[PDB]
Amino acid sequence: QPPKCDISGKEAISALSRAKSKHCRQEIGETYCRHKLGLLMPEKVTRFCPLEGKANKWDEDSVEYMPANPVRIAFVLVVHGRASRQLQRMFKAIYHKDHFYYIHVDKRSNYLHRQVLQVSRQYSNVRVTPWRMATIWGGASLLSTYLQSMRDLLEMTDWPWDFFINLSAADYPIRTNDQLVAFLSRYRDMNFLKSHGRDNARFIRKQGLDRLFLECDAHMWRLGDRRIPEGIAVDGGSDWFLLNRRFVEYVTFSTDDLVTKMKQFYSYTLLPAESFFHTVLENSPHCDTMVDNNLRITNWNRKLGCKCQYKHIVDWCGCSPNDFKPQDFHRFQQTARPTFFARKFEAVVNQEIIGQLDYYLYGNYPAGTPGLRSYWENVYDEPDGIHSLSDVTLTLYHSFARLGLRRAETSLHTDGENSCRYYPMGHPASVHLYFLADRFQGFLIKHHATNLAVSKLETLETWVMPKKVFKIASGRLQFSEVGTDWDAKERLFRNFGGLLGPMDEPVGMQKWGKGPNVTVTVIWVDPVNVIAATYDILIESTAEFTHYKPPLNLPLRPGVWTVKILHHWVPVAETKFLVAPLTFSNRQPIKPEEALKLHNGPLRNAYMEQSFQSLNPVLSLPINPAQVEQARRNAASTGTALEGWLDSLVGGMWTAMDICATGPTACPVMQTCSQTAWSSFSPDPKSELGAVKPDGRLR
Numbered sequence: 001q002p003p004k005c006d007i008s009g010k011e012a013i014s015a016l017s018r019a020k021s022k023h024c025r026q027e028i029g030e031t032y033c034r035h036k037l038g039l040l041m042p043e044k045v046t047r048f049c050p051l052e053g054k055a056n057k058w059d060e061d062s063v064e065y066m067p068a069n070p071v072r073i074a075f076v077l078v079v080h081g082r083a084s085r086q087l088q089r090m091f092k093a094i095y096h097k098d099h100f101y102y103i104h105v106d107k108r109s110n111y112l113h114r115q116v117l118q119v120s121r122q123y124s125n126v127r128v129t130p131w132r133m134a135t136i137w138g139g140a141s142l143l144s145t146y147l148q149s150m151r152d153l154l155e156m157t158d159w160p161w162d163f164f165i166n167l168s169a170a171d172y173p174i175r176t177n178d179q180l181v182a183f184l185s186r187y188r189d190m191n192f193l194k195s196h197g198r199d200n201a202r203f204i205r206k207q208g209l210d211r212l213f214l215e216c217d218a219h220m221w222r223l224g225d226r227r228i229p230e231g232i233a234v235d236g237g238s239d240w241f242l243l244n245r246r247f248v249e250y251v252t253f254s255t256d257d258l259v260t261k262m263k264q265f266y267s268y269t270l271l272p273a274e275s276f277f278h279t280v281l282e283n284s285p286h287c288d289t290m291v292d293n294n295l296r297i298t299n300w301n302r303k304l305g306c307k308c309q310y311k312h313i314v315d316w317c318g319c320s321p322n323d324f325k326p327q328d329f330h331r332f333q334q335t336a337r338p339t340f341f342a343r344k345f346e347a348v349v350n351q352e353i354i355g356q357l358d359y360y361l362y363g364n365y366p367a368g369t370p371g372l373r374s375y376w377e378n379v380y381d382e383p384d385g386i387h388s389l390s391d392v393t394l395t396l397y398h399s400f401a402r403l404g405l406r407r408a409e410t411s412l413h414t415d416g417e418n419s420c421r422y423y424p425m426g427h428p429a430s431v432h433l434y435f436l437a438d439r440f441q442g443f444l445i446k447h448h449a450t451n452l453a454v455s456k457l458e459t460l461e462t463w464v465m466p467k468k469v470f471k472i473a474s475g476r477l478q479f480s481e482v483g484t485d486w487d488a489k490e491r492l493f494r495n496f497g498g499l500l501g502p503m504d505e506p507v508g509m510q511k512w513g514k515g516p517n518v519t520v521t522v523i524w525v526d527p528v529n530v531i532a533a534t535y536d537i538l539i540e541s542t543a544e545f546t547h548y549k550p551p552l553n554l555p556l557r558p559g560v561w562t563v564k565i566l567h568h569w570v571p572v573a574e575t576k577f578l579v580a581p582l583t584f585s586n587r588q589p590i591k592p593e594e595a596l597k598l599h600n601g602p603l604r605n606a607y608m609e610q611s612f613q614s615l616n617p618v619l620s621l622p623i624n625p626a627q628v629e630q631a632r633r634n635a636a637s638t639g640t641a642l643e644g645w646l647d648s649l650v651g652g653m654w655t656a657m658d659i660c661a662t663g664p665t666a667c668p669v670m671q672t673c674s675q676t677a678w679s680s681f682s683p684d685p686k687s688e689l690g691a692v693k694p695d696g697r698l699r
Ligand SMILES: *[C@@H]1O[C@H](CO)[C@@H](O)[C@H](O)[C@H]1NC(C)=O
Pocket: 516, 517, 518
């Protein structure tokens, strides 16, 4: 169907041409045409503040007194992702029985929501939002989430709260609850918001406040220009704040000119929570309550955090803070200004700094407490279904489980019946990442299998760990790795296991120490010694990481690839990586014609237009005609033959470290999972939540 008005703006045309759903196209057009007539945005707004401008209203010993009328705090936790045990650890740190906790879990994070429900069922002062939005980065929906949660909280008459504080799963306190309550009790009529403080016209342009945006199909579309309304001062800064009940009441229930028109304006705004509350407060009757300090330390690093990493999500470029590391601990003790929270923290990136901070605030755990240096994070959970996995991860998780079953059989030494022989049943039940002392240890896979001696089903967990493959030879090179999903801000691969299939596009990374600039040669070698790519790269004196994604035609030949680094044909180092053949297509066993198309190498017979056959003799990489033919045979296989090819490849690159039983077992040499040090079933008291103590705490 055609639009209600001629659509000629280049930005709107670009959005309409990229939008996937008919609903989104119609809403894009409806929004554009409304604005074109001048009926969508306000252009003049009343200012109620009696001040000429802004108001901008520290002794370390002032947070040590004991208040007679302590504030009660409503924490709104806006969380997403997989890091449930870290969220539980932070919740333990900030919990007190006289506060309140209201938890919004991103609609797309169903595993995390199930874990949060278990928390809300234990404690009367914890509730979960029954509505759930998909709060994409920069989305307008983040303000809708805050405004709805404020209305909900104001109508819970059994929760008499005095302040509203927002936190994510990557936040952590840097002072005790006692000190937070003492400080807020002394300034209970103030509002804590941090402004950019620099040139305001530049802030408006950098933020895109003079641009019209629309959130639809989990994307933020830019649709054109708009005027800043006259009569008000527009301000902004951090979207992390603390607001008192009186101002939250005004924002929620006022119908005056300011609140009404700003709610309309910010419904079509990028990063609305970074400026909506500043602009309303400063122009409201409450303007003289504003303190230019959000009581947070935010770990900005412009060199690493501003790589326009959200381009596929919003029609704009943005920045995000870095994760703290152990060398940052001294920053949590600064004395310039009062601060009570900090971000960001990620246990999969660095857990040591989280431990240092928690023990600093609340003391060591007793000697003999297990799991303090470990971290477990669920990356697949059965209720979400195998269609939420990929064919690559479904194939490999199956193979890891079979590797565990083979370890159980070979671990029993006996000349009679082997009561540790198993037959696998069904699909993996769960998968965890496992870390120890900030070193990746591999995957834990929970699975079901029949013990063949007694003919009974058993539930097991297998630990698999990747074999070391980086090898140096007689420079500033420290490490080399191949992977996917490179995180330029944290400088690591978010595909932690390096799981790859024939249609993946691998990335080569190098890590360097200090020294003078140098140039090296990178060579990619496929499983039958076909040289797929060669290139030189400059390593500047100041470079720490380098990475590059060669344009290799697909599919890649399955097997063990090798990536070599040379310095003027002198060997430097090498690493290896596995392109796995897939046993599933659309989560069903792969058929002969599917496998042949997928497993016989690139459709162009060559990985790139330029050939490197003249290099094979130079590097002693002869192509064996027998191995080439065997790869053709392997490509046509399915079923049991294909399973044997896959498992021999996986076994060459992964080790089954151990396997345990969750319940009873007829295998005499298998340990109970809860009694191991490594299982996701073993004790982890730092993330466990129990009964409330006499002092009202869980920690
Ligand atoms: C480093 O770079 C400079 C120019 O930037 C170049 O002249 C020099 O040859 C390079 N290598 C060394 C060791 O200086």
